[PDB]
Design an enzyme around this catalytic site. Sequence first.
Site, PDB file in Angstrom:
ATOM      1  N   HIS A 110       0.848  -1.157   0.000  1.00 19.02           N
ATOM      2  CA  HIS A 110       0.000   0.000   0.000  1.00 19.02           C
ATOM      3  C   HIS A 110       0.894   1.220   0.000  1.00 19.02           C
ATOM      4  O   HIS A 110       1.617   1.484   0.917  1.00 19.02           O
ATOM      5  CB  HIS A 110      -0.875  -0.010   1.227  1.00 19.02           C
ATOM      6  CG  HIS A 110      -1.831   1.125   1.330  1.00 19.02           C
ATOM      7  ND1 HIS A 110      -2.091   1.758   2.517  1.00 19.02           N
ATOM      8  CD2 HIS A 110      -2.639   1.695   0.424  1.00 19.02           C
ATOM      9  CE1 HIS A 110      -3.001   2.687   2.329  1.00 19.02           C
ATOM     10  NE2 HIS A 110      -3.341   2.677   1.065  1.00 19.02           N
ATOM     11  N   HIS A 152      -0.812  10.668  -1.886  1.00 14.79           N
ATOM     12  CA  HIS A 152      -2.107  10.323  -1.351  1.00 14.79           C
ATOM     13  C   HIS A 152      -3.097  11.438  -1.009  1.00 14.79           C
ATOM     14  O   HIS A 152      -4.132  11.471  -1.560  1.00 14.79           O
ATOM     15  CB  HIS A 152      -1.992   9.433  -0.115  1.00 14.79           C
ATOM     16  CG  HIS A 152      -3.308   9.153   0.533  1.00 14.79           C
ATOM     17  ND1 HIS A 152      -4.153   8.170   0.097  1.00 14.79           N
ATOM     18  CD2 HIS A 152      -3.927   9.740   1.569  1.00 14.79           C
ATOM     19  CE1 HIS A 152      -5.239   8.164   0.832  1.00 14.79           C
ATOM     20  NE2 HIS A 152      -5.122   9.103   1.738  1.00 14.79           N
TER      21      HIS A 152
HETATM   22 MG   LIG Z   1      -4.610   4.652  -2.333  1.00 11.33          MG
END
Ligand SMILES: [Mg+2]
Length: 248
Positions: free
Chosen positions: A12, A54
């Site tokens: 991630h 992000h």
């Molecule tokens: Mg993401």
Amino acid sequence: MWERDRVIVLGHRGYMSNYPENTLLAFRKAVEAGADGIELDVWLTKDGRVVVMHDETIDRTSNMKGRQKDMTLEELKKADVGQGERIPTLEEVFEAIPRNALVNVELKDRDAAREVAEIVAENNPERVMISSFDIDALREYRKYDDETTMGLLIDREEVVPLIPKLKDELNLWSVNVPMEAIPLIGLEKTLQALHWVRSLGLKVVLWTENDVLFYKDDNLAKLKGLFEVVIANDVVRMIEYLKKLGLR
Ligand SMILES: [Mg+2]
């Protein structure tokens, strides 16, 4: 490529537990640690470049401040995103990792759809998956690319009833859903929902906040057979857990 026997593990934002998130270093490390691939977030800069970040702003992960959509690439490259890492372009990422590594590009910005699609076309699209929480971003992406594997990220209960229609509209491969469902509606209802989506022909990608719900109560094990991909911060820990379960 996304249809395989072995459960898929994606880091991630790279191997973000141990390296700065959404950096070339993190991405390389994830794959070097045995992950099948990576997940990452993209936005479009003020000058039409596709960059990896992000949040809507660089403040959290960098030594600087600003909204990337309002900055140029060159401005962006000033920043330090951990240990001297610079914010990468999407092309930078494809360069950095193996050609057959799986890449899940999460579109945070609908404006980026067209560019992302062009870059993807040039970079082994078979190992790419496009996902978003934003249906409109997905719809926009489909204007430019109707073949690449697509996943619908979900964090709102009310989206669920829409899934059959969305699947048909967008040609979704998967729905990408959170372990948070379990505390929310209970394990059994979660199992039932997963069965429902599978009944539609969808595959399943699993994610959670900071990896915690994968392991609590051995939640992830309970879902055995109902998921094809997991997105995890700690790549090694996830790989170990899956081996122990005989899935890796
Ligand atoms: Mg993401």
